[PDB]
Design a protein around this nucleic acid. Structure first.
Ligand code: MG
Ligand code: ZN
Ligand code: ZN
Ligand code: ZN
Lengths: 114, 65, 130, 266, 84, 138, 43, 156, 240, 559, 160, 47
RNA sequence: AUCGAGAGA
DNA sequence: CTCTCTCGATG
C-alpha cells in the first residue's frame, strides 16, 4: 500500500548521486560523506578499514533510519592529509585483500575432492 | 495447503522432499526425526518446515469442480 | 607537571558484585596519616592482596583525544596502569587531615592525606606501576 | 598468497566448511552479507496464466514458481531487464519457460519443476534449467491435479538480487563462528551454577587452544580466525557462491572508488 | 467607560496566549502578502517572520485585557515584556 | 453398563469426586508441582480428566496452568481472530468475506484436547522461529 | 465456529463471577472482555 | 520540610558557584548590608498581585509568605557567606535570577485551570486498582453520599 | 499474537542480513521484546518455546497438555541431549557487524497466529468529503469516506490547552459552517433573505432595515429550529 | 452532546501506531498516502511562489504536491481532472491546497482523551508504510502500546491555528506537566534497561564503538573525550560516552541509601556540569520522576534542548543495546534447588501454623479480637499467615536471583516488572481471593465437589502453593480463574465508572479559569479562589524544595 | 499511631500515641465526652464535619478525603487542582455534589447545564422562566461556534 | 469437518445462542434489605 | 440513514 | 448514568 519499491534499496533514484561529500563544520579537517543505496555491508567494512590508517583521527559510519538504504560516514584525518585519499587507500586496501582472498580460496578449492 | 517450496527461515529447498519424507515414514517405517535427518534437514527450522506442515491439498482434490 | 607521588600497600580487594572492577583499599608506607581507596580494572591490571603499587597524580603528559600515534611521542608515563578523571570533592576530616575525591569514568577514588596541590581541576592523571 | 588465508575443512556439492585466517571481523561479516543477499541469480519474476482449474490460487502457484531454483551459472553474461534496451524482455535479459499440465490418470497427477520446459533461446549460455537435486529426478513439487484439472501457464525468469526478493537467494544458511573459547570475551555467558558445564562445547574448539587459568585476560587480541560453512541451494555452486560473493563486494567497492574518481569533475 | 493608562494592575508581562494570538494574527497578515516591518534576512515562513517581528517590537497591535466586572486594560505589544 | 454417569450441579452437590484415578491407591521430584494428598476416602465419582473443564478455545492454549488466568482469557478471545483454514470446501463457498492462511501448520506444542477439535487437521497459525531480544528497538 | 456453536447468553446478585458450580460445565477462561464479561459464557 | 514551591534556589546557587568559578578559600567581597538589605529588598519584587490598595497588598504578602520563608532560610548571612561563599556579582546574579524565575512561575491569565484540575484528578483516577478506598470512595465523595459504606470516627 | 495473549503488531521488517543469527546460521522469523514477559507472567509462552524446540529437533510432537507431569527440567534435559543450552539460550551474532552479542538470546520455535486486524483495512484519511443531510456534518465510516469525531473530551483537551481558534476551526470550517440571518427585533430565524436583491424581509415585525447575519454551526441552527418547533424561542441578540 | 459539543471533522486521519527510535520526541510518522490525502491551504506570496508552483506542477498522486487551486473569484481548480493542470500561472492572493509536508504542525491524539497530554502538536515526517510512527518517550502521556492501538491526527487550516498548535500544544511544551508538577515523559523500555546496562562500572567501551556512539549524537562537538583508561588499553566507560548526551550546566545531586560520595554500591547519582560523576543511571534518574534529569534539563536548558536530549539518549543507548543484546528465558524464572526447598518448607510451616490455629479454634480456645467474630479472627489470622508465606517465599526467590538474571535486571532498571512477578513466577503465586475473602463455599460447606464438607484448609479455600513455573493444580487453576474473573469484572466496572466520573468533573469545573487579576472565577464572575492555588503560581513551574528551618534542634538552628 | 512531635531540645522525635479508631459515627456527642482531646478528633464523614465544625472545616476534611483517595493508590496530584474542586464544591454555602443534583442546579447558563445529563427539561424550564444566557460560558460559545473567552480568546486584539 | 448444528436462513448460517434463565418450580428463600419492612421472602416461580 | 448484533484499546 | 471499525437484517 505505502510500501516502497524494493529496487530502491540498490537502484539510485532520479538525480540521487552515489556519494555526497560535505565539509564538516564541527571539527577542522573533517568530512561527512553520504553513501546512497548502501547498507552496513559497505559502511562497517570501510569504517573498519579506516581505523587501520594511523593517520586517521576519526572514522565512524551510521544508518540514520532502516527504512532508507543509505549511511553517513564521518572521517577526520591529520593535517596535510586529505580524507578522500584516506577513503581511497582504504578502498584499494579492501580490494587487494579481497583479490588475494579470492585467489587463495580458488587455489584451496582446486585441492579438494567430492 | 501444499508443502512449502523452501524454508522460511534459512531458505533451503524442502518442497522436493515431501514425498520422500512420506515414503521414509511408511515404506522404511522410520520415525519423523530420522526421516527428517536422512533428508538432510539438520537445522530445526527446515526440520520444522516439513514436520509442522499439514498437506491439505489432498482433501481439496476430493471435490469435482 | 607532577602533583603527587607515593607508594601504597594494598590492604584489601573487593569485587562488589562485579567481575571487571574491584575496589582496592590501601595505605601509604611513608605517612601514617595517609590512606587510599581506588576502583581498579582488574581485567587490565590485576591487583591481588598485599601489593606495593607505585601511585602518581599528574596534571599532564581541551583538545580532542588523538590515538597513540605513532609514537614517536612523549607518553610521559611508562607505567603499568594509567587513568584519567576529575576531582569533585575536597573533604576536610581535620586540619591535619585533608581528603580528595576523584572520579575516573565512574571508578571513584578517595585519597586522604595532609600536606596538597590538588585543585578541583579536570587535569587528573592517575599513574600506577608495579 | 600474501593476505587472508583459507583452509577448506570440508567440501561438497551443497556445502563448504572452511576457515578464514588473517581477516578483520567486518570483512568476514560483509562477505557473509553479500553471500546472503547481493549475488545475481536467475529466477521466475513474471508468470502469465492461461488456464488454471487446479485447487491452488493463481498468485499462489506464481509465488511457488518464484521460489523455484534455476540454473544461474552463466548469469554473468545475462542482463538485467532494467538495463536491456529491449521492450519488456528478450533473450539477452530473460529466460522464458512454459508449463502445461493436465490431469490424465484417475490417480492424483503431480506437477513438478521438471515439467517446466525452456522455450526462449539460450544461445549457448548455461541458464534457465531448473535445479533437480531430487533422487527420483522430479524436483520441486509445484502442484497437484485431480482428474480433469488443467494448469497452462508461461514463466519469464529475469536476473535479480536477493536484496530485492529472497527468491533470488543463491545461498541458504551460512554458518559463522569466531573464538569458540570466548578468549576475546565478546560474550558474557548466562548460567545458574557452572558456566562451562551448562553451555555445550563447540566443534571448532578442536581447532584452537584452551585458555590457562594462570594467564590473565588478553586485552590486545582481536578476531583473526573465523569458522564458516556456506550452503548453496543449487542455482550456483558453493565455490562460486563465495567467489562471486567476494567479486561482488570488491566490485561494489570499486564502484565507490570510481565515484570518487568521477567527483573530480568541475 | 474605560481604564486609564496609569494605575494598571494587570501583569506587565505578555501571557503565552497573548503571544500565540499575536504571532498567529501577524503570521495571518503576512500570509496574505502584507508589508513586513523588519528585515527578512532569508526568512520566508510568515510565522517565523512574525516571531522576528515580535523580537524587534515591530508589531502595531494592542491587547485589550478584560476584567470580570467589565473593565478593560490596554497594553501595546511594544510595551509588554516577552519572557518566554 | 453403569460405568459412566451424567451429573448436573444439583446432584453434584451430594457426591465426592476424585480429581485423578490415582487417588484410589494406598523420594520425589522437586521439579513437579506440589499436589495435596487425598485426605478423603468415601469417593463416589472420579473425574474423566481435569482438562475437560476448559472450552474449545481454551483447549488450544499450551500449558494454560502455567499462565495468569486473564492471559488465558485474552488468548481465548484472540484465538477466534486467527487466520487459517475454517473449512476444506472454502473454494466452493461464497461467503461475505473469508481469510485462508497460505501455509497452515500444526503447532509443535499441542494438547491432548486438540485431537477432538481437529486443530491439527485445520490449524490457525504457523510455527515461527521466535527470538526474545532487544535488537534495534523497533 | 466451534466456539460460537457452544455459547451461552444471559439477560439482565453476581452473575458475572465465576461461580464454584461452574466447574466442569462452563469454561472458566473463555469469556469476552468488557461489558459482556461473565454474562456470555461457553460450554 | 519538603514542599512544592516555585524557583529551585539550590540549582541557582550551584549555578552561581559554577558560572563565576568561586573557590572555597577566598574572602567574600560582600557586606552585611548587601546581604540583609539585598534579600529584604528582593522580597519586594516577587510580585503576584499588582494593586495599589491595602487589600491587594495584603493578599500579595500572603501569597508569597512561604516562598519568602524559603528565601530567608536559604539566603541567611551565615549561609550565604560560609556555606555558599558567594561574591558580590554572584549574589546579585542570584537575586536577579530568583526574581526572574519567580516572575516566570506566575500563572498566566486565561489559564483554563478548571478543566486542567478536573483532568488532573480524573486521569490518575483511571489508573487506580479496612475502610472503603479508591474509585468507589471517590464516587461516594463526588456524589456526596448521605450514607457512606464505612463511616469511621478517629478519636485522639 | 502468540497462544498466550501476547498481542502485538509489526514494528519493522529486516532482511536475513540485518537479522541476528546463531552460529548455525539460523535467523529468527520473528523478534519480540522481553519486556512483554515479566509483567504479564506468561511463563507458558517460554515453556511452549522450549518444548517446541525440543519437539522440533527430535521430530516428535510436544505435549503441552495442561495438568501433566511434564516439567521444564525434563524438557531442559532433553534439549541438552540434543546439544543446546538447557534453558533455550543461544549465542547470537549481530547481523550488522558480525560481532557476538554479550547476553545470549532465548531463541526457538513458537506457534504464532496472524490476527484479522491489518493496517490497510484500518488506515483512513479525509480532506473535505461527503456530508450528511440532516446535520450537514461529515458522514460516519471509513468505507463511506467519512471523518473522525472531535468528541467532547477532545474539546475539553483543547480548552485545557487554551487553543480557542483551533477549537473554533474544528467546530466550523472543518465541519458545518453555516450563515444565518437574524431579525433585530424578536431575534429568531424568521428572516426571509432575498439575496441578489438585498430584500431582507421579516413577516411578523415588519423588518427590512434592522437585520443581522451570524455564523453558527448547522447543528446549532438545527437545534434552534427544533426548539422553535417545540414552542420555545431561542432569541439571538447581538448586543449586550 | 453529539453534534455541538463534538462532531466529525474534515482534514483528519486515523491509523495503527508504531514506535520509532529514530524519530524525535515532537515528531510524528505520517504514511505517504495520508500525506497526499490531507491538505493545507497556502496563500501565494513572493516568498513561496516558486515552491508552490513546483507543488502544483507535481499535482496529486505524487508527493509533495497539491490537490486544489483556489482563485480570486472563489472557483476551485481540481488538479487531477483539469486540462490546465500542466500550465498554471499562480497569481498572488490565490490559495494552493498542498499536501502535508515535513515539519508541519499537526494535532496527534489518542482516545480516550483523559487529560491535555492526550492531544499534542507534533512535527510531520512523511514516511513510507501505513503506520503512525511516534517516539517511544511519548508513549506515557498518550497512554498507548503498539499491540493494535490506533491514533488520530488533525490538520490546522490557517496560520493562526497552526501557530496555536506550535506555540501552545507543542510536545516539548508539554514535557513538564502541571498535573503533578513533574515531567510526564521519560526514558522507557529498551532505552531504560539499556541505560542501566551501559552505566555499570564493569561496562567499558573500546575505541571504534566509542567513535560510532560519538557520531550518533547530532549535538556532538566533534571533540573526542579523553578515555577513563589510558594504558594498557584506551577504554571509555558507559557514563563517560553517555555524558555527551547531557548538556553543559546541568547539575544533578541525589543520595539513595548508603550513598556516601564514594558509593561502594555505585548507587545514588551525582552529575557535575553535564558530566555524570558516579551512580547507575535508571528510572530514578532518567525516568519521569520529580527531581529527575528531564525536569532539571527542561527547567534549565529549555524544552527544546530537553526533547533533543530525549533524542540523543535514545539514539546512543539504543545503539549500544543493539550491539550488546538483551533477552529473557525460562532460566530467569528458575531459582536454585535449595532455594526451592526452603520455599517449599516455608509453605509447609505456614500450612502447619494455619493447621494449628484451626485446631485451636475447633477446640473453642480461640479468643476473638475485640470487635469481631471468632470466625472472622480465624479468617484474618489464616489469611495473614498465607500472605506472609507468599511474601517470604517470594523474597527468598528474589534473593536467590543473580545480577545476570534478566528479569531481575528489568526490575532493577525499572523498565518492567516488580517483586511480586518474580514471587509468583518462581516461588508461589499465593492466595486467591474474591470479594475480599478467600474462595467461599459455592457448594454446601465446600468449595469444590472434590473436598469434604467444612474444609477450611488453605488448599481448599484457594491457596496455591505452586508457582507459574511449577504448574497449577486443577483446583488452584479454577480458583485462580475465579480471582482473575473478578479482576476483569471490576476492571471493566472501574474503567466505566471512572469514564463517567471524569466527565462529571470536567462538566463541573468547565467554565473555571484565571482572569487578569489572578482571581479564579467562572462564567458568573463568582470568585472560587481570590488567588489561584492560594499563591498565584502555575503548577508547571513548581518543584519540591526543603524548608531547612522547620527541622533540626534549636542548637543546630543557632549554629 | 506513631507521631512526629517537637522535642524540648528542638528536633522532631517519633512519639507514639494511642488512638481510637471506630466503626460508627456520631461526632455531635463523641467530641463532648470528658477524657479525649476534642480539637483533634476527626471522622471520614465530611458531612458531620460540615454540620458540626462549620463549612471551612468541611472544606478541609473534604480535601483531606479526596487527597487520601488519590494518594491511597500511590499517585500524586498537585494541591491546587483538588483544592479547586473542593472549593467549587464548598463555595455555594454547603456541600455541592458533582452530579445532576448539585452543580447542574446552579444559576449558570441554560445551554451549559443543558449540555450535561438533563438536557431537554433544562431547556424547557429555561424557556418557561425566560432566562438570559450571557454567552460567556465555554460550552455556549462551543454551541454557537464562536471563539470562546478561553486562553487565547480571553481578550481582544486591536491596532495602535 | 463441518459439524453442523446451525440453520440456513436466506443463505445465511444462523446459530441459536443458548439462553440462560432461572429454574422454575424451585423454592428459594432470600433475606431482604435493612430498609425493607419484610425481612425474609420465600418465593417460587411456577411453570 | 433508523434500531439490534460482533469486535478493536 | 455509560472512540472505532464491522457485519445483517429492517423501512
Ligand atoms: Mg493496547
Ligand atoms: Zn531452514
Ligand atoms: Zn532484453
Ligand atoms: Zn422578527
Amino acid at each position: 500500500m505505502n510500501a516502497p519499491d524494493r529496487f530502491e534499496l540498490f537502484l539510485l533514484g532520479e538525480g540521487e548521486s552515489k556519494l555526497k561529500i560535505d565539509p564538516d563544520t564541527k571539527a577542522p579537517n573533517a568530512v561527512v560523506i553520504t553513501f546512497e543505496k548502501e547498507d552496513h555491508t559497505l559502511g562497517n567494512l570501510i569504517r573498519a578499514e579506516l581505523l587501520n590508517d594511523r593517520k586517521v583521527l576519526f572514522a565512524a559510519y551510521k544508518v540514520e533510519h532502516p527504512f532508507f538504504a543509505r549511511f553517513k560516514l564521518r572521517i577526520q584525518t591529520t593535517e596535510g592529509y586529505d580524507p578522500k585519499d584516506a577513503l581511497k587507500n582504504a578502498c584499494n586496501s579492501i580490494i587487494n585483500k579481497l583479490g588475494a582472498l579470492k585467489t587463495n580460496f580458488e587455489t584451496e578449492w582446486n585441492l579438494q575432492t567430492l | 495447503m501444499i508443502v512449502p517450496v523452501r524454508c522460511f527461515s534459512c531458505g533451503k529447498v524442502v518442497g522436493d522432499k515431501w514425498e520422500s519424507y512420506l515414503n521414509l515414514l511408511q515404506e522404511d517405517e522410520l520415525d519423523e526425526g530420522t526421516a527428517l535427518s536422512r533428508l538432510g534437514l539438520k537445522r530445526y527450522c527446515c526440520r520444522r518446515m516439513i514436520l509442522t506442515h499439514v498437506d491439505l491439498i489432498e482433501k481439496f482434490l476430493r471435490y469435482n469442480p | 607537571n607532577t602533583l603527587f607521588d607515593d607508594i601504597f600497600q594494598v590492604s584489601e580487594v573487593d569485587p562488589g558484585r562485579y567481575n571487571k572492577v574491584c575496589r582496592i583499599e590501601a595505605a601509604s608506607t611513608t605517612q601514617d596519616q595517609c590512606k587510599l581507596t581506588l576502583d581498579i580494572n582488574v581485567e587490565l591490571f590485576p591487583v591481588a592482596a598485599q601489593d606495593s603499587l607505585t601511585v602518581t597524580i599528574a596534571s599532564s603528559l581541551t583538545r580532542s583525544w588523538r590515538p597513540p600515534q605513532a609514537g614517536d611521542r612523549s607518553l610521559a608515563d611508562d607505567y603499568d596502569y594509567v587513568m584519567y578523571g576529575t576531582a569533585y570533592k575536597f573533604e576536610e576530616v581535620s586540619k591535619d587531615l585533608i581528603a580528595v575525591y576523584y572520579s575516573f569514568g565512574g571508578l571513584l577514588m578517595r585519597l586522604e592525606g595532609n600536606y596538597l596541590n590538588n585543585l578541583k581541576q579536570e587535569n587528573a592523571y592517575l599513574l600506577i606501576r608495579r | 598468497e600474501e593476505g587472508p588465508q583459507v583452509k577448506i575443512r570440508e567440501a561438497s556439492k551443497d556445502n563448504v566448511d572452511f576457515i578464514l585466517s588473517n581477516v578483520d571481523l567486518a570483512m568476514a561479516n560483509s562477505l557473509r552479507r553479500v553471500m546472503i543477499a547481493e549475488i545475481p541469480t536467475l529466477a521466475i519474476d513474471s508468470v502469465e496464466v492461461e488456464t488454471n482449474t487446479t485447487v491452488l490460487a493463481d498468485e499462489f502457484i506464481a509465488h511457488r514458481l518464484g521460489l523455484i531454483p534455476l540454473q544461474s551459472m552463466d548469469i554473468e553474461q545475462l542482463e538485467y531487464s532494467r538495463d536491456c534496451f529491449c521492450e519488456d524482455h528478450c533473450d539477452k535479459c530473460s529466460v522464458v519457460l512454459t508449463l502445461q499440465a493436465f490431469g490424465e490418470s484417475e490417480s492424483t497427477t503431480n506437477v513438478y519443476s521438471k515439467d517446466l520446459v525452456i522455450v526462449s533461446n539460450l544461445m549457448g549460455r548455461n541458464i534457465g534449467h531448473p535445479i533437480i537435486q531430487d533422487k527420483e529426478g522430479n524436483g520441486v513439487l509445484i502442484c497437484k491435479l485431480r482428474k480433469g484439472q488443467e494448469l497452462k501457464l508461461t514463466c519469464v525468469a529475469k536476473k535479480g538480487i536477493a536484496k530485492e526478493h529472497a527468491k533470488w537467494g543463491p545461498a541458504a544458511a551460512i554458518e559463522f563462528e569466531y573464538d569458540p573459547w570466548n578468549k576475546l570475551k565478546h560474550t558474557d555467558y548466562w548460567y545458574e551454577q557452572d558456566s562451562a558445564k551448562e553451555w555445550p562445547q563447540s566443534k571448532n574448539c578442536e581447532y584452537e587452544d584452551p585458555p590457562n587459568e594462570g594467564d590473565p585476560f588478553d586485552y590486545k587480541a582481536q578476531a583473526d580466525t573465523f569458522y564458516m560453512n556456506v550452503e548453496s541451494v543449487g542455482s550456483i555452486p558453493v565455490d562460486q557462491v563465495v567467489v562471486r560473493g567476494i567479486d561482488t563486494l570488491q566490485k561494489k567497492v570499486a564502484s565507490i572508488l570510481l565515484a570518487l574518481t568521477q567527483m573530480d569533475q568541475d | 467607560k474605560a481604564i486609564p493608562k496609569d494605575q494598571r494592575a494587570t501583569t506587565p508581562y505578555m501571557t503565552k496566549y497573548e503571544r500565540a494570538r499575536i504571532l498567529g494574527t501577524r503570521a495571518l497578515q503576512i500570509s496574505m502578502n502584507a508589508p513586513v516591518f523588519v528585515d527578512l534576512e532569508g526568512e520566508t515562513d510568515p510565522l517565523r517572520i512574525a516571531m522576528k517581528e515580535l523580537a524587534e517590537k515591530k508589531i502595531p497591535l494592542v491587547i485589550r485585557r478584560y476584567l470580570p466586572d467589565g473593565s478593560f486594560e490596554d497594553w501595546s505589544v511594544e510595551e509588554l515584556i516577552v519572557d518566554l | 453398563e453403569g460405568l459412566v454417569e451424567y451429573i448436573d450441579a444439583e446432584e453434584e452437590e451430594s457426591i465426592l469426586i476424585a480429581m485423578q484415578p490415582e487417588d484410589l491407591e494406598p523420594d520425589v521430584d522437586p521439579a513437579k508441582r506440589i499436589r495435596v494428598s487425598h485426605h478423603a476416602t468415601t469417593f463416589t465419582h472420579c473425574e474423566i480428566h481435569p482438562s475437560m473443564i476448559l472450552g474449545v478455545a481454551a483447549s488450544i492454549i499450551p500449558f494454560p496452568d502455567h499462565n495468569q488466568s486473564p492471559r488465558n482469557t485474552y488468548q481465548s478471545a484472540m484465538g477466534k481472530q486467527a487466520m487459517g483454514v475454517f473449512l476444506t470446501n472454502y473454494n466452493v463457498r461464497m461467503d461475505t468475506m473469508a481469510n485462508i492462511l497460505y501455509y497452515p501448520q500444526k503447532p509443535l506444542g499441542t494438547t491432548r484436547a486438540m485431537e477432538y477439535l481437529k486443530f491439527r487437521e485445520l490449524p490457525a497459525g504457523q510455527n515461527a522461529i521466535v527470538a526474545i531480544a532487544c535488537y534495534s528497538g523497533y | 465456529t466451534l466456539s460460537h456453536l457452544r455459547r451461552t447468553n444471559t439477560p439482565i446478585a453476581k452473575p458475572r463471577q465465576l461461580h464454584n458450580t461452574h466447574w466442569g460445565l462452563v469454561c472458566p477462561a473463555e469469556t469476552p472482555e468488557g461489558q459482556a464479561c461473565g454474562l456470555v459464557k461457553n460450554l | 520540610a519538603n514542599w512544592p514551591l516555585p524557583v529551585n534556589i539550590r540549582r541557582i546557587i550551584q549555578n552561581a558557584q559554577q558560572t563565576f568559578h568561586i573557590d572555597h578559600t577566598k574572602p567574600s567581597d560582600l557586606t552585611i548590608k548587601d546581604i540583609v538589605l539585598g534579600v529584604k529588598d528582593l522580597q519586594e519584587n516577587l510580585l503576584v498581585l499588582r494593586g495599589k490598595n491595602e487589600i491587594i497588598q495584603n493578599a500579595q504578602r500572603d501569597a508569597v509568605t512561604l516562598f519568602c520563608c524559603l528565601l530567608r532560610s536559604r539566603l541567611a548571612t551565615r549561609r550565604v557567606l560560609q556555606e555558599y561563599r558567594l561574591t558580590k556579582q554572584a549574589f546579585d546574579w542570584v537575586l536577579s535570577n530568583i526574581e526572574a524565575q519567580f516572575l516566570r512561575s506566575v500563572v498566566h491569565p486565561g489559564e483554563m485551570v478548571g478543566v486542567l484540575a478536573a483532568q488532573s484528578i480524573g486521569e490518575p483516577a483511571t489508573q487506580m486498582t479496612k475502610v472503603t478506598s479508591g474509585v468507589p470512595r471517590l464516587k461516594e465523595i463526588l456524589n456526596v453520599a448521605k450514607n457512606m459504606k464505612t463511616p469511621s470516627l478517629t478519636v485522639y | 499474537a502468540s497462544r498466550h495473549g501476547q498481542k502485538g503488531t509489526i514494528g519493522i521488517t529486516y532482511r536475513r542480513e540485518d537479522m541476528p543469527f546463531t552460529a548455525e546460521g539460523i535467523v529468527p522469523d520473528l523478534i519480540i521484546n522481553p519486556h512483554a514477559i515479566p509483567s504479564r507472567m506468561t511463563v507458558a509462552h517460554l515453556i511452549e518455546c522450549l518444548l517446541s524446540k525440543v519437539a522440533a529437533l527430535s521430530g516428535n510432537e510436544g505435549d503441552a497438555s495442561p495438568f501433566t507431569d511434564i516439567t521444564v527440567e525434563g524438557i531442559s534435559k532433553l534439549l541438552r541431549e540434543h546439544g543446546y543450552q538447557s534453558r533455550g539460550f543461544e549465542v547470537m551474532y549481530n547481523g550488522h557487524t558480525g560481532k557476538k552479542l554479550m547476553a545470549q538470546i532465548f531463541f526457538g520455535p513458537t506457534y504464532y497466529q496472524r490476527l484479522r486486524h491489518m493496517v490497510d483495512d484500518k488506515i483512513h484519511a479525509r480532506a473535505r468529503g461527503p456530508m450528511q443531510v440532516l446535520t450537514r456534518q461529515p458522514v460516519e465510516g471509513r468505507s463511506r469516506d467519512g471523518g473522525l469525531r472531535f468528541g467532547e473530551m477532545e474539546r475539553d483537551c483543547m480548552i485545557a490547552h487554551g487553543a480557542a481558534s483551533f477549537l473554533k476551526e474544528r467546530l466550523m470550517e472543518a465541519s458545518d459552517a453555516f450563515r444565518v440571518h437574524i431579525c433585530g427585533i424578536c431575534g429568531l430565524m424568521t428572516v426571509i433573505a432575498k439575496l441578489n436583491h438585498n430584500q431582507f424581509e421579516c413577516k411578523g415585525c415588519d423588518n427590512k432595515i434592522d437585520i443581522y447575519q451570524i455564523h453558527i454551526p448547522y447543528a446549532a441552527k438545527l437545534l434552534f429550529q427544533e426548539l422553535m418547533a417545540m414552542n420555545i424561542t431561542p432569541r439571538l441578540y447581538t448586543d449586550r | 452532546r453529539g453534534n455541538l459539543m463534538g462532531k466529525r471533522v474534515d482534514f483528519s486521519a486515523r491509523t495503527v501506531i508504531s514506535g520509532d527510535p529514530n524519530l524525535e520526541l515532537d515528531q510524528v510518522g505520517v504514511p505517504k498516502s495520508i500525506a497526499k490525502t490531507l491538505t493545507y491551504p497556502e496563500v501565494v506570496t513572493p516568498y513561496n511562489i516558486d515552491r508552490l508552483t513546483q507543488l502544483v506542477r507535481n499535482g496529486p498522486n505524487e508527493h509533495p504536491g497539491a490537490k486544489y487551486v483556489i482563485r480570486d473569484s472563489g472557483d476551485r481548480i481540481d488538479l487531477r481532472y483539469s486540462k490546465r493542470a500542466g500550465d498554471i500561472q499562480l497569481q498572488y492572493g490565490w490559495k494552493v491546497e498542498r499536501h502535508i509536508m515535513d515539519n508541519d504542525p499537526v494535532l496527534f491524539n489518542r482516545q480516550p482523551s483523559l487529560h491535555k497530554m492526550s492531544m499534542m502538536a507534533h512535527r510531520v515526517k512523511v514516511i513510507p508504510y501505513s503506520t503512525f510512527r511516534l517516539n517511544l518517550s511519548v508513549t506515557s502521556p498518550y497512554n498507548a502500546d503498539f499491540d493494535g492501538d490506533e491514533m488520530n491526527l488533525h490538520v490546522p487550516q490557517s496560520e493562526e491555528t497552526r501557530a496555536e498548535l506550535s506555540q501552545l500544544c507543542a510536545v516539548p511544551l508539554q514535557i513538564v506537566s502541571p498535573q503533578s508538577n513533574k515531567p510526564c515523559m521519560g526514558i522507557v523500555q529498551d532505552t531504560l534497561c539499556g541505560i542501566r546496562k551501559l552505566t555499570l562500572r564493569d561496562t567499558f567501551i573500546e575505541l571504534d564503538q566509542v567513535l560510532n556512539m560519538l557520531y550518533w549524537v547530532p549535538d556532538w562537538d566533534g571533540v573526542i573525550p579523553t578515555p577513563a583508561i589510558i594504558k594498557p588499553k584506551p577504554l571509555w566507560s558507559g557514563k563517560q560516552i553517555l555524558s555527551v548526551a547531557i548538556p553543559n550546566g546541568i547539575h544533578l545531586q541525589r543520595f539513595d541509601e548508603g550513598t556516601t560520595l564514594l558509593s561502594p554500591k555505585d548507587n545514588g547519582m551525582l552529575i557535575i556540569d553535564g558530566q555524570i560523576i558516579f551512580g547507575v543511571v535508571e528510572k530514578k534518574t532518567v525516568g519521569s520522576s520529580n527531581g529527575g534529569l528531564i525536569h532539571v534539563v527542561t527547567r534549565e536548558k529549555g524544552p527544546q534542548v530537553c526533547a533533543k536530549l530525549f533524542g540523543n539518549i535514545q539514539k546512543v543507548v539504543n545503539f549500544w543495546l543493539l550491539h550488546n543484546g538483551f533477552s529473557t528465558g525460562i532460566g530467569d524464572t528458575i531459582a536454585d534447588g535449595p532455594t526451592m526447598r526452603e520455599i517449599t518448607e516455608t509453605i509447609a510451616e505456614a500450612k502447619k501454623k494455619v493447621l494449628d490455629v484451626t485446631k485451636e479454634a475447633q477446640a473453642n480456645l480461640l479468643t476473638a479480637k475485640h470487635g469481631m467474630t471468632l470466625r472472622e479472627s480465624f479468617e484474618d489470622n489464616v489469611v495473614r499467615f498465607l500472605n506472609e508465606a507468599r511474601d517470604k517465599a517470594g523474597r527468598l526467590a528474589e534473593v536467590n536471583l543473580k545480577d545476570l538474571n534478566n528479569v531481575k535486571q528489568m526490575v532493577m532498571a525499572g523498565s518492567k516488572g516488580s517483586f511480586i512477578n518474580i514471587a509468583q513466577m518462581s516461588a508461589c503465586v499465593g492466595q486467591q481471593s474474591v470479594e475480599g475473602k478467600r474462595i467461599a463455599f459455592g457448594f454446601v460447606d465446600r468449595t469444590l465437589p472434590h473436598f469434604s464438607k467444612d474444609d477450611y484448609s488453605p488448599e481448599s479455600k484457594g491457596f496455591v502453593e505452586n508457582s507459574y513455573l511449577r504448574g497449577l493444580t486443577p483446583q488452584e487453576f479454577f480458583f485462580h480463574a475465579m480471582g482473575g474473573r473478578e479482576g476483569l469484572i471490576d476492571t471493566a466496572v472501574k474503567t466505566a465508572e471512572t469514564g463517567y466520573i471524569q466527565r462529571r468533573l470536567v462538566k463541573a469545573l468547565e467554565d473555571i479559569m484565571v482572569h487578569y487579576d489572578n482571581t479564579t472565577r467562572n462564567s458568573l464572575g463568582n470568585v472560587i479562589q481570590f488567588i489561584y492555588g492560594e499563591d498565584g503560581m502555575d503548577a508547571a513551574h513548581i518543584e519540591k524544595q526543603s524548608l531547612d528551618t522547620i527541622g533540626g534542634s534549636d542548637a543546630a538552628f543557632e549554629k | 499511631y506513631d507521631r512526629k512531635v517537637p522535642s524540648p531540645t528542638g528536633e522532631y522525635v517519633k512519639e507514639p500515641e494511642w488512638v481510637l479508631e471506630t466503626d460508627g459515627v456520631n461526632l455531635s456527642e463523641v467530641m463532648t465526652v470528658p477524657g479525649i482531646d476534642p480539637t483533634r478528633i476527626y471522622t471520614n464523614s465530611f458531612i458531620d464535619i460540615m454540620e458540626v465544625l462549620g463549612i471551612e472545616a468541611g472544606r478541609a476534611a473534604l480535601y483531606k478525603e479526596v487527597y487520601n483517595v488519590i494518594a491511597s493508590d500511590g499517585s500524586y496530584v498537585n494541591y491546587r487542582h483538588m483544592a479547586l474542586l473542593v472549593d467549587v464544591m464548598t463555595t455555594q454555602g454547603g456541600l455541592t455534589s458533582v452530579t445532576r443534583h448539585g452543580f447542574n442546579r446552579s444559576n449558570t447558563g441554560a445551554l451549559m447545564r443543558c449540555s450535561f445529563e438533563e438536557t431537554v427539561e433544562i431547556l424547557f424550564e429555561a424557556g418557561a422562566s425566560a432566562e438570559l444566557d450571557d454567552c460567556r460560558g465555554v460550552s455556549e460559545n462551543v454551541i454557537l461556534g464562536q471563539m470562546a473567552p478561553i486562553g487565547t480568546g480571553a481578550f481582544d486584539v486591536m491596532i495602535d | 469437518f463441518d459439524m453442523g448444528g446451525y440453520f440456513i436462513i436466506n443463505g445465511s448460517e444462523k446459530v441459536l445462542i443458548a439462553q440462560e434463565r432461572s429454574a422454575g418450580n424451585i423454592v428459594q428463600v432470600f433475606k431482604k434489605a435493612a430498609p425493607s419492612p419484610i425481612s425474609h421472602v420465600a418465593e417460587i416461580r411456577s411453570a
